[PDB]
């Protein structure tokens, strides 16, 4: 259980040191996306919430393949804008409802410290 609070101001610095195994000890859902939306990391808390098997979604496109419910200006559009601008820090509520019971969550999207990588953090509300 890695002690990092959701929405922490310096979360990108703290998560810079975690490998896939340490990511699995977070109290919340954590997805790392590349600039095109491909999933690079996907932790255990996130699979708990979504029912996805983390090893099976690495490599897949989040917006096209795994989470089409996020393919809308309200989620993907903010993502695309941040990638385009090279800056991203936003939090909002969303409902996850593809192939699963509709689940309301808090989403925090933030640019990683490292290269062209972007974090998506999720927790139940
Ligand atoms: C909408 O599609 C939100 C996200 C999401 C992620 C994974 C799975 O399996 C369903 C939905």
UniProtKB/Swiss-Prot annotation:
Domain named PAS: residues: 23-86
Superkingdom of this protein's organism: Bacteria
Gene Ontology molecular function, alphabetical: identical protein binding; photoreceptor activity
PTM: The 4-hydroxycinnamic acid (p-coumaric acid) chromophore is covalently bound via a thioester linkage.
Keywords: Chromophore, Photoreceptor protein, Receptor, Sensory transduction
Matching InterPro entries: PAS (IPR000014), PAS-like_dom_sf (IPR035965), PAS_fold (IPR013767), PYP (IPR012130)
GO BP: phototransduction; regulation of DNA-templated transcription
Residues bearing the modification S-(4-hydroxycinnamyl)cysteine: 69
Acetylation as UniProt keyword: no
Function: Photoactive blue light protein. Probably functions as a photoreceptor for a negative phototaxis response.
SUBUNIT field: Monomer.
NCBIfam families listed in its UniProt record: photo_yellow (TIGR02373)
Protein name: Photoactive yellow protein
Origin species: Halorhodospira halophila
Lineage: Bacteria, Pseudomonadati, Pseudomonadota, Gammaproteobacteria, Chromatiales
Gene assigned in the entry: pyp
